[PDB]
Structure formats: structure tokens, C-alpha cells
């Protein structure tokens, strides 16, 4: 759909993800390819299949984020399943078709909500005429001057101009309605009332399908957890089983959704792994073939951490500022304050378990616990979170390890 060049995609993706340029390009080539396909002829359009990607990297360094923003950027249906979720189905469990169902139930919970956007002006325009018709019951068969039912727009203009908030005046209108009511309801009863007439069925539910088939993006997390490991055998066939089960989905097939028959032949798949125990070549042959693109993501550094805190649009730091503003408080972060928040997060991840950028949200959040509470009784102030403040609130916690495993 989008006519954005790969470079433009990466750019757009740079507004949310720090670093990981390679994964960005890989995912950007994929998107542009969907465009490249439609520009082709009959034959070549069947033959050309998505170049599914296999993202390789450690926890929380931007794998899902990238895929989430990519999806979001192409207004495409997105689903994220954890591969092992099916490893237990050899005993009982979810079938892999569920992935295409959910990518559908969400490809619908999407086409519907985005039908409330398009149809949010229709009910408050060619539909608010309801209350105005019981306010000034139109002429017994309007005349006809294409400006006659517009002439009132004097008496009529007043009932609309005053309808800029002034209500709670009980009236009635028309299973049409007929029932007597108010306006904080008669009006809202009209909101949905006149709207369900613009949206139809066999096009909405039919399109959600067209979406998944043409723009669906499936993110299979921890694909590496279903590869063969030299510790046993019984569990391996169980793992490799999930691989064979997923095979139809990325090779091309038809799944049954309670909204129709979805064809996976053109859904893009972004698999993901850490590959510390297994290697991508441990994936079954048929799957390695369907995962042509391999891209690695690097571990985040303290500088990446500093940048992640403030650079992204609606970065946690920005959000925080926003939220404190809600309380009428002016929060402000100095460069060294952030340099220290990042520093702390790095420390805990090295001294205990490394959870990537996730650590920032918990560190940042513990740091602010006090202002977050007192914010209401601090309205009209300029609080500055600087290196000092940071140290007073985090040092002790970060310093104590066993405590970090609990509190940070």
C-alpha cells in the first residue's frame, strides 16, 4: 500500500527505534517488496512470495519493536505469537492455525475501529439532523431551492449553534425509536443509531480478509526454542513438530476463520531468536528456505540507552513529562540525569540478569515513584530530575544486588 521507499521506511522507523539499522533495512526491503509485487503481471504475481525474515539477537534490543512499528507504519494486521506456545500441543494445546485466526480477529478489531473513525463525522452531520427535526419539525414537504432547507440556517442556525454544548432538554424521535428521552442520550442514542447504516457486512469482514492476505505480518518470537538441542530426543520431535506445524503457514495454504477463508501465501513472517543454544541451520530445511532474510541485531550500549530515553517519539521520558504535566507539574531531565538513569540500568543488567532496554522502564519508574505520588500536591512547580536526584533515589537499590532482583 504505502509508496514509501526502503530508505523512507527506515527513516520513519528511526523515529521509534534506536540503532539496529540493519534490521530496519531488512524489514524495509520486505515492505517495499509488497509494492514491487503489485507492479507486476499476472504470472509473476503468484510466483513472487514474501522474503520472510529471521531476526537474530539478545532480549529487548528492538526486535519486536521494529516489527511492531513496521506493521503499524503500513497499517497492516499484526500478530505476535510465542513459538513454544505450541510445543505442548503434542499433549494438548492451540493449533497453529490460531495464528491466522487471531491475525484475523485483530485484522477485524482493526477494520471495525477504523470504521468508527471514518464514521464519526457522518453521525454528527447527516445524522444530528435528528434532534433538529424535533426542534423545528421541517416544512410539510419542503419546497425546493437547494438553499431553502438552508434558508433557515437562521432559526435552524440557532438550534445548531446552541447545540455546541447546550443540551439535557428531553424530547423524542424515532424499530426506529419513538420512545421519549433526553439529549445527553437522545443525541448519543443517535451517535451509533445513524452510523450502523453506513457500515455494511460483506465488505467489512470481507476486507479484513483481504488485509491479512495482502498485508498480514506474523511475528513468531523464540523460533529458536523449537530447534533441536543435544540434551534429549522425545522433546525434540515435539519441537520439530511445531516447525512442521508452522510449515504450511509460511509455505502457502488455506486456513478456516469464522470470517472467511484466509490464504497465507502472501503474509510476511518475521521469526525471531537469540540463537545461543541453537543456530538457524538447526531449523528444518523447509523452514530455512522460507526464511531467506537473516539479520542480526546488536546488544544495546549505555549510549543506546541514553538515546532510547529521550530520542524516540513519545519516549518514556517524554511520556513521563507529559503525565506529570497532567498534575500541573513541570518535570525536567538534565543531560547528566539521563546519563545516570541509563548508567543505572546498565549496572543492574550486568550485575544480575540482562533484560535489555526493558530495564530502563523499571529503573525510570522506580526513580519517579515519589514524584508520581506527590505530583498532585506539587502542582505549579518545576521539579528537575538531575544527576543528584537520580543518585539519591537509585544508588542504594542498584548497589544492593539481591535487592535489585526484587525491586528493579
Amino acid at each position: 500500500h504505502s509508496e514509501m521507499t526502503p530508505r523512507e521506511i527506515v527513516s520513519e522507523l528511526d523515529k521509534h527505534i534506536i540503532g539496529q539499522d540493519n534490521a530496519k533495512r531488512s524489514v524495509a526491503i520486505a515492505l517495499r517488496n509488497r509494492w514491487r509485487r503489485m507492479q507486476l503481471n499476472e504470472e509473476l504475481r503468484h510466483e513472487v512470495t514474501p522474503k520472510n525474515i529471521l531476526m537474530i539477537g539478545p532480549t529487548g534490543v528492538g526486535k519486536t519493536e521494529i516489527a511492531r512499528r513496521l506493521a503499524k507504519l503500513a497499517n497492516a494486521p499484526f500478530i505476535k505469537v510465542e513459538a513454544t506456545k505450541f510445543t505442548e500441543v503434542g499433549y494438548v494445546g492451540k493449533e497453529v492455525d490460531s495464528i491466522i485466526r487471531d491475525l484475523t480477529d485483530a485484522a477485524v478489531k482493526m477494520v471495525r475501529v477504523q470504521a468508527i473513525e471514518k464514521n464519526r463525522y457522518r453521525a454528527e452531520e447527516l445524522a444530528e439532523e435528528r434532534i433538529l427535526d424535533v426542534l423545528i419539525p421541517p416544512a410539510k414537504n419542503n419546497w425546493g431551492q437547494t438553499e431553502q432547507q438552508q434558508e433557515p440556517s437562521a432559526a435552524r442556525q440557532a438550534f445548531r449553534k446552541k447545540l455546541r454544548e447546550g443540551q439535557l432538554d428531553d424530547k423524542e424521535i424515532e424499530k426506529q425509536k419513538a420512545r421519549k428521552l433526553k439529549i445527553k442520550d437522545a443525541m448519543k442514542l443517535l451517535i451509533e443509531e445513524e452510523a450502523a447504516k453506513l457500515v455494511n457486512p460483506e465488505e467489512l469482514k470481507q476486507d479484513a480478509i483481504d488485509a491479512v492476505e495482502q498485508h498480514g505480518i506474523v511475528f513468531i518470537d523464540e523460533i529458536d526454542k523449537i530447534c533441536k538441542r543435544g540434551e534429549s530426543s522425545g522433546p525434540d520431535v515435539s519441537r520439530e513438530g511445531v516447525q512442521r506445524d508452522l510449515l504450511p503457514l509460511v509455505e502457502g495454504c488455506t486456513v478456516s476463520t469464522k470470517h472467511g477463508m484466509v490464504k497465507t501465501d502472501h503474509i510476511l513472517f518475521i521469526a525471531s531468536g537469540a540463537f545461543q543454544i541453537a543456530k538457524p541451520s538447526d531449523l528444518i530445511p523447509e523452514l530455512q528456505g522460507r526464511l531467506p532474510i537473516r539479520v542480526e541485531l546488536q546488544a544495546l550500549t549505555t549510549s543506546d540507552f541514553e538515546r532510547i530515553l529521550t530520542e524516540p517519539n513519545a519516549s518514556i521520558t517524554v511520556q513521563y513529562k507529559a503525565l506529570m504535566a497532567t498534575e500541573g507539574v513541570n518535570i525536567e531531565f538534565t543531560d547528566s540525569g539521563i546519563k545516570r538513569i541509563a548508567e543505572a540500568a546498565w549496572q543492574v543488567n550486568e550485575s544480575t540478569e540482562n533484560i535489555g532496554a526493558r530495564r530502563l522502564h523499571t529503573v525510570l519508574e522506580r526513580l519517579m515513584e515519589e514524584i508520581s505520588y506527590d505530583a498532585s500536591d506539587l502542582s505549579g512547580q518545576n521539579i528537575t530530575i538531575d544527576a543528584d536526584y537520580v543518585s539519591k533515589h537509585l544508588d542504594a537499590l542498584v548497589a544492593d544486588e539481591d535487592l535489585s532482583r526484587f525491586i528493579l
Binding site: A139, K140, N141, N142, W143, G144, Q145
Partner: protein, 174 residues
């Protein structure tokens, strides 16, 4: 009764008397037989029930609302129902109607009639009015209003069912 309509020098009129008769006696002497319609643009006169009126004139108005001021058509569309609709049928009367465009008679028969010179003279006094109107219209420079008036009097003088109470509705345009 006597309804007279005339048209001369960008002026059209409809004038009527006010006698309602029952047998050989006068029931009322000031019956309004000439009204106005379509946002005082269309004039009309009539012979019949005061209700038949307030029903055939209301409808006529809506028919104009369904045909942008175009007299004739609403008039055609009017006489249309007036001869079809089970109920509307029992209605009896003789509408004389005239706008800046033209003037014409409508009968329960559904007919739409445009008389020789937009000259109309319906009712038992009709012809006497016509005779006098025609005379005046062809031998004097008098005005449409002056005609209908004088003609109406002549009528009421001959017609035992027509009096000298008037109700005129003029119209200017040029």
C-alpha cells in the same frame, strides 16, 4: 356565486361575491371566495365548501412545493389526485387559480383549463360576468382589477345567486 378572473398589463386578478344560498334564501352574505396561496405568490378563487377549499388549496400548495413555482404542473398534478384518490373524489368545487405565469380552472373531473384570454368566469353568474368582462376588455382601456370589479357587479345584478360583496386578489409583475 360568481368568480371572475382577468389579466391585463402585467396585472392578474380573481374576484368573487359572497352569497351562499340554500333553497330560496341567503344563508350567509360575506363568504370569502378568493384567497392566496404558495407564500402569497399564487392567487385563487373558488365555488364550494369552505372545507373542500381548505383541503384543495392546502394540497395545491404542496403540489407547488413539488414543482418549483411552476403553476400549470402543480395544477395538473392537482386535478390528478382530485379524480383518483378514493376520498378526495367526493370533494366538489371549481378552483380558479392564477400566478404571474398564467391562470386556469380546475374541476373535480380532473380537467385543467386555460380559457381564451386567461379570462375566467365560473359559477352561476359566470356568463353574465364573462359577457360584461369581454365587453370592457375589448372596448376600453380599463385595468384588470377595474374589469373584474365592474364585471362582478354586473353579474350580481343579473344573478339571483350572486351578491355585491367582493373579495379581490390582485398581482403585479410586468
Amino acid at each position: 356565486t360568481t368568480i371572475v378572473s382577468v389579466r391585463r398589463n402585467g396585472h392578474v386578478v380573481i374576484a368573487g361575491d359572497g352569497q351562499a344560498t340554500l333553497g330560496n334564501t341567503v344563508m350567509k352574505g360575506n363568504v370569502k371566495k378568493v384567497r392566496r396561496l404558495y407564500n402569497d405568490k399564487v392567487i385563487a378563487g373558488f365555488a364550494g365548501g369552505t372545507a373542500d377549499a381548505f383541503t384543495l388549496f392546502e394540497l395545491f400548495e404542496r403540489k407547488l412545493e413539488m414543482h418549483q413555482g411552476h403553476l400549470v404542473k402543480a395544477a395538473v398534478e392537482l386535478a390528478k389526485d382530485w379524480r383518483t384518490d378514493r376520498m378526495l373524489r367526493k370533494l366538489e368545487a371549481l378552483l380558479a387559480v392564477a400566478d404571474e405565469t398564467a391562470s386556469l380552472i380546475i374541476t373535480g373531473n380532473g380537467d385543467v383549463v386555460q380559457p381564451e384570454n386567461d379570462l375566467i368566469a365560473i359559477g352561476s353568474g359566470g356568463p353574465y360576468a364573462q359577457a360584461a368582462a369581454r365587453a370592457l376588455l375589448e372596448n376600453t382601456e380599463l385595468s384588470a382589477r377595474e374589469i373584474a370589479e365592474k364585471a362582478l357587479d354586473i353579474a350580481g345584478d343579473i344573478c339571483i345567486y350572486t351578491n355585491h360583496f367582493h373579495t379581490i386578489e390582485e398581482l403585479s409583475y410586468k
